[PDB]
């Protein structure tokens, strides 16, 4: 099948602190034994999980990108390590540590350890959002297990399965100040969050269809519509364009809201920076897959 030559208007951006953060990421993994085998380390190396960080937070300072990579590497290990009797139990253990429950797992231990560092001395409103989206992300592993599909349901959840919302919540960790509550969960911003995430997720399904597993927009369409593989790819291609249309609309809608609100300049600027970074992610993941 022919993979579409996806167009995204947003300028390319890559974080220059990559080589430094990557060493620090590996140094962490080493300490906690997140990759306690060569087989497991080869899986990590092959996927370019370190490179993707450089495309998620390209405007981030060295320290932010480093905590970033640790989150990417940890969640990589969690995914690597996964009916719903079992799914519930393990997802519950992980989800517990995010609320200070003690552990009786290297992986879980590392989650709790990273979470302490991430959330320490940070606004409660920020942590709630990060954990909200990270919990939501973990929670997809339970639902998707319990369904072994409908497209609309899948879409609603794939937004969180892809990670981008909790990944984007870490982008705030490099802004001059945190986004006000009005900005973070405002109409435009939530529109952008969803549309950006799906766009990334749908392209990701197109690139990953061959390799994979039934929770794929391409597979779902093909099974429900009995149609051919290329036509399904063609349909997801339409979906993908639709997200872009929403992304572009929302960025505009945002400006209107930032103006509506009449916040102080330092804040307004931050939201403009955040959204732009989200938009940047869209072009970023294309190049990323180039390798």
CATH code of the domain covering residue 109: 1.10.600.10
Total tally of structural domains belonging to the chain: 1
Helix (H) or strand (E) holding 127: helix 124-146
Method by which this entry was solved = X-ray
CB 216 within 8 A of CB 209: yes
**204 annotated as belonging to a binding site for a ligand:** yes
State the angle between helix axes of 151-161 and 124-146 in degrees (0 to 180), rounded to the nearest 10: 140
**95 annotated as belonging to a binding site for a ligand:** no
Which residue, 198, 189, 156, 154, is CA-closest to 171?
Answer: 189
CA distances from 172 to 61, 126, 136, 278 (A): 12, 9, 19, 11
CA distances from 9 to 56, 194, 241, 282, 284 (A): 17, 18, 12, 9, 11
Domain range for 259 is: 1-291
**277 annotated as belonging to a binding site for a ligand:** no
284 CB neighbour count, 10 Å cutoff: 25
**216 annotated as belonging to a binding site for a ligand:** no
CA distances from 195 to 159, 161, 242, 245, 253 (A): 8, 14, 8, 9, 13
Residue tagged 């306690």 (tokens): 36
Task: To the nearest 10°, report the CA torsion of 246, 273, 157, 96.
Answer: -170
Q: Is 17 helix (H, G, I), strand (E, B) or coil?
A: coil
**79 annotated as belonging to a binding site for a ligand:** yes
**190 annotated as belonging to a binding site for a ligand:** no
CB 180 within 8 A of CB 263: yes
């Amino acid at each position: 099948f022919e993979i579409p030559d996806f167009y995204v208007p947003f300028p390319l951006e890559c974080n220059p602190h990559l080589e430094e953060a990557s060493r620090a990421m590996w140094e962490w993994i080493d300490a906690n034994g997140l990759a306690p085998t060569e087989r497991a380390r080869d899986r990590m190396r092959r996927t370019g999980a370190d490179l993707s960080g450089a495309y998620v937070w390209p405007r981030a300072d060295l320290d932010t990108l480093t905590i970033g990579l640790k989150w990417i590497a940890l969640t990589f290990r969690i995914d690597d390590q996964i009916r719903l009797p079992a799914r519930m139990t393990a997802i519950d253990e992980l989800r517990g540590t995010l609320h200070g429950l003690p552990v009786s797992s290297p992986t879980a231990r590392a989650l709790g350890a990273l979470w302490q560092e991430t959330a320490l001395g940070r606004p409660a409103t920020w942590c709630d959002a990060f954990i909200g989206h990270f919990e939501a992300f973990l929670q997809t592993y339970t639902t998707e297990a319990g369904l072994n599909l409908r497209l609309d349901d899948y879409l609603d959840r794939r937004m969180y399965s892809v990670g981008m919302p909790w990944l984007w919540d870490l982008d705030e960790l490099r802004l001059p100040i945190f986004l006000p509550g009005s900005v973070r969960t405002c109409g435009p911003m939530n529109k952008l969050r969803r549309a950006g995430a799906l766009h990334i997720a749908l392209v990701n399904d197109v690139f990953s269809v061959e390799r994979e597993y039934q929770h794929n927009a391409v597979t779902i369409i093909r099974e429900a519509q009995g149609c051919s593989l290329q036509e399904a790819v063609d349909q997801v291609a339409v979906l993908v364009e639709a997200q872009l249309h929403t992304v572009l609309q929302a960025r505009q809608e945002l400006l209107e809201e930032l103006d509506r609100q009449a916040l102080p300049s330092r804040a307004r600027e931050a939201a403009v920076d955040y959204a732009a970074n989200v938009a940047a992610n869209l072009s970023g993941q294309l190049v990323w897959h180039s390798s």
